[PDB]
């Protein structure tokens, strides 16, 4: 019993973190096989960051200008290329701790673990979601760039995020491991505003299921609704529209609890309209939206 | 910027988790040097758990009755002893991944990371606090016993908790690594009720400091207070008394922000009396008390 915001165990990713230095900029790299992946802004002077021409900045850089340190041992860089907004540094040594891995591009509402690193050294692990506006609300200081987001499927690490940017509003932006930004963001020190940070409705519903499974049941009501009726109320409260695809994904939690998805929708509708009235659900005074249906099943079932 | 409930990177502890089986009970063990530590209730049939005599149950057990598996390799048990509520199984192989480590007994209000394990396999990592009633609010299913709580100081793992028990209220109880329960709990399937789960005031104040450092400032008010005045209001709201020792510990956050500890107390006093009025602080609608002053400094400064 009990329900926690839970990260994946980080060891497999800890074994991949290195330090990358270009001139006076130090940040983190991910060492998989004989490639080190890092943000291309490692080549920029904070002056460069105002209007960087990365192709032109890169002409001035050689393999020996990229200093890669794994623990307190230097890796030899034998090649470098830019792919979108990441650099790939080819090194002469395959990472001996390379786990089975994939690069995946996640969808908004998907959750992942972040291993926050400084100077190639892990500081902490926390759980994030890709927001509907393609930001994440992370915890990142200067030096944390190149920190990665990941999911684990038994022994396969799916890498989904590399940290690049803090927006003036202190929310976060980054890329997949092919160097493509999530959302409309660019690696330039310019005014970039996030769109509406809507609530991930399907995740709230999953977490209300988690709450019922763990004995927090006070919010269960006598009503049902329809997707169309729910969605009118959702839109008014800056919740993402619920689709039949989301209803299908909640089926296993519906089954386990015997609460129809549309009944839980009608419970959520009353919580939006009525508020919490100073009550809590799973120790929260707001509706949590950074657990996916898969996360709830995993944690409620004890997958390793 | 940003402030997250952050666990320590778990790799060093992942390398210590094993499976312990006694008859038909499987749970987790911690393998440090040539000793495997696990809950002594591994020897109980769920029937035994109603009124176990552990000394008498142990007479019936030999070294070869304790099956220890590290990955999919069996460890040879060459000795076993009971220390308080843990078993120490001596194995013929020192754990090659043993990190530098200490056993520490923490105080209520201290935070730690939990690596939730099943069958000796890590499932997730989350951050906990020792509650003032000596429970923790974890996420533990059957099979999670022997999962451990820890802090890391650079490369030294301080082990502070081993999971033993879920109370009928679905809160959690366990021991330090010398097998001594936190609080008045016993490893017996009997009615055990927790005391008042009071709020860890010094941790709330630390987190209000984190909030100011990260730009959440709306709750800062025009008032100050005294420890005695604050404490009258604290007691009324089931907050722990604040001591001059807590004020001293908050000094570095006072200094960084230039907000006197007693001014932040007076802000906290108005939040207790007035509520949040539907506002949030660092994405929370309630006052978070599972960050220590040390945690706030670590995360706000980027310690690895
Ligand atoms: O954003 C950063 N550098 C940068 C990137 C692109 C444009 C301009 C600047 N660093 C940073 C600091 C704190 C948290 N996360 C990231
Ligand atoms: O408490 C458990 N066994 C036990 C221990 C002492 C007395 C009676 C029973 N298992 C458990 C289950 C779920 C979460 N945490 C622990």
Q: B148 and B265: one domain?
A: no
Q: A112 and A147: one domain?
A: yes
The DSSP output letter for A199 is: B
8 Å CB contact between A99 and A155: yes
* Domain stops at, among A64, A99, A134: A99
Q: B73 and B110: one domain?
A: no
Rounded CA separation B206/A75 (Å)? 40
Q: B54 and B3: one domain?
A: no
Measure CB to CB from residue A125 to each of B125, B128, B139 and give the nearest one.
B125
Q: B169 and B211: one domain?
A: no
Q: B214 and B293: one domain?
A: yes
Atom of ligand 2 nearest to the CA of B164: 5
Within 13 Å of residue A232, how many CA atoms lie on the same side as its CB? Answer: 5
Rounded CA separation A49/A39 (Å)? 12
Q: A144 and A8: one domain?
A: yes
- Residue identifier of the C-alpha nearest atom 4 of ligand 1: A165
> Where residue B93 sits, what CATH number does that domain have?
2.40.10.10
> Where residue A223 sits, what CATH number does that domain have?
1.10.1840.10
DSSP helix/strand/coil, A293: helix
Q: Looking at beta carbons, which residues of chain A come within 8 Å of B284?
A: 284-286
DSSP letters for chain B: ------BPP-HHHHTTEEEEEETTEEEEEEEETTEEEEEGGGG--TTGGGS--HHHHHHT--GGGEEEEETTEEEPEEEEEEETTEEEEEESS--TTPPEEEE--PPTT-EEEEEEEETTEEEEEEEEE--TTS-B-----TT-TT-EEEEEETTEEEEEEEEEEE-TTS-EEEE-TTSPBSTT--SSSS--------B-HHHHHHHHHHHHHTT--TT--S----HHHHHHHHHHTTBPPP-HHHHHHTHHHHHHHT--HHHHHHHHHHHHHH--TT--BTTBSS------HHHHHHHHHT--
- Residue identifier of the C-alpha nearest atom 2 of ligand 1: A165
8 Å CB contact between A66 and A89: yes
Residues of B annotated as part of the active site: 41, 145
Q: B30 and B132: one domain?
A: no
Domain count for chain B: 3
DSSP helix/strand/coil, A97: coil
Give the experimental resolution in Å.
1.6
* Domain stops at, among A197, A216, A245: A197
The number of residues making up chain A comes to: 304
The reply to whether residue A166 touches residue B1, judged by beta carbons under 8 angstroms, is: yes
Say whether residue B170 is in contact with chain A using an 8 A CB cutoff: yes
Helix (H) or strand (E) holding A58: helix A54-59
Experimental method: X-ray
Q: A119 and A45: one domain?
A: no
Domain housing B262: 198-301
Token pair for residue B109?
A: 């209000």
Q: B4 and B151: one domain?
A: yes
Q: A76 and A203: one domain?
A: no
Q: B33 and B163: one domain?
A: no
8 Å CB contact between A214 and A2: yes
Interface test with B, best of A11, A14, A213 (most B CBs within 10 A): A11
Rounded CA separation B59/A45 (Å)? 70
* Domain stops at, among B99, B115, B145: B99
CB atoms within 10 A of CB B47: 9
Give the CA-trace dihedral at B241, B247, B253, B255, to 10 degrees.
150
Token pair for residue B159?
A: 């082990």
């Amino acid at each position: 019993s009990g329900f926690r915001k839970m990260a994946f165990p980080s060891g497999k990713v800890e074994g991949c973190m290195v330090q990358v230095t270009c001139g006076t900029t130090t940040l983190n790299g991910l060492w998989l096989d004989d490639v080190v992946y890092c943000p291309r802004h490692v080549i920029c002077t904070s002056e460069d960051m105002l209007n960087p021409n990365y192709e032109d900045l890169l002409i001035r850089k050689s393999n020996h200008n990229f200093l890669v340190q794994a623990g307190n041992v230097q890796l030899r860089v034998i090649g470098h290329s830019m792919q979108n907004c990441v650099l790939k540094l080819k090194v002469d040594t395959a990472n001996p701790k390379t786990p089975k891995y994939k690069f995946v591009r996640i969808q908004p509402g998907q959750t992942f673990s972040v291993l926050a690193c400084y100077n190639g050294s892990p500081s902490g692990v926390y759980q994030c979601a890709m927001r509907p506006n393609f930001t994440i609300k992370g915890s990142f200081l200067n030096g944390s760039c190149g920190s990665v987001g990941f999911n684990i499927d038994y022994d396969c690490v799916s890498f989904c995020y590399m940290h690049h940017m803090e927006l003036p509003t202190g929310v976060h932006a980054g890329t997949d491991l092919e160097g493509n930004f999530y959302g409309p963001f660019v690696d330039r020190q310019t005014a970039q505003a996030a769109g509406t940070d809507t609530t991930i409705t399907v995740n709230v519903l999953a977490w209300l299921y988690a709450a019922v499974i763990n004995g927090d049941r006070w919010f269960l009501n006598r009503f049902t609704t329809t997707l169309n009726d729910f969605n009118l109320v959702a839109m008014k409260y800056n919740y993402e529209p619920l689709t039949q695809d989301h209803v299908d994904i909640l089926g296993p939690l519906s089954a386990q609890t015997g609460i129809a998805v549309l009944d839980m929708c009608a419970s959520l509708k009353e919580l939006l309209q009525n508020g919490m009235n100073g009550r809590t659900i799973l120790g929260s005074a707001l509706l949590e939206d950074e657990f996916t249906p898969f996360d709830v099943v995993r944690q409620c079932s004890g997958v390793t």
